[PDB]
């Protein structure tokens, strides 16, 4: 399962 940091990184990469 992806880490929360990975989720946050993806958010900021695309916003």
């Amino acid at each position, epitope marked *: *399962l992806d*880490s*929360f*940091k*990975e*989720e*946050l990184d*993806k*958010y*900021f990469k695309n*916003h």
Partner: antibody
Amino acid sequence: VQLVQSGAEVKKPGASVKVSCQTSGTSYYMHWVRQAPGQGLEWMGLITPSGDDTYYAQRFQGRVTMTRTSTSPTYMELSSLTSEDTAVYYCAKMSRAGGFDVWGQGTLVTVSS
Amino acid sequence: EVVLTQSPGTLSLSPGERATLSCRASQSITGRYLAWYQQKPGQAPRLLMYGESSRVTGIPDRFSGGGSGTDFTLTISRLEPEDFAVYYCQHFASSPPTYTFGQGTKLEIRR
């Protein structure tokens, strides 16, 4: 990682306050959380490991700014202060799992006439 | 946004007894997005556990938890004096980034 914040502040309504958070000595997502005397915890927002972007809690959007160069302390500035902003302000490091694993010692900000 | 409601407001138990602390989310969540904290007077909170009972380094075995959907529990099985404190749950989301906290449960010594 140990987090050391700046000292307590006293402010009049309408002023602003700027608190610093320094890693004593990898960069990490840094968050700010405040706690009014005798009350619970309230998240304010976060800043990315590089400092290139932020995201704030809805209640503070338009009033708060979080800044970091790269290896400079990180700051939280809160404007248009009222007595409701009296609280201890904490900075915190996020772990990869999303919880706050290291906390600063807190900075008391008192807002009063 | 997710809203967290903790119960009870105050829990009064004796050393050696088992404490059950509840956190209810306003919508169904995966417990990976819930964390528990301990806070004592004069101190910053301390991270304990995620919603799925996964403890962080240095947290004793007597701390456990469980849940799925809207209801989550932190269980402290054989209370020690150092366990009496205020406990908060926390939920986090990444899109858009949003954290929230429950209002806290005070775990106090019954004598």
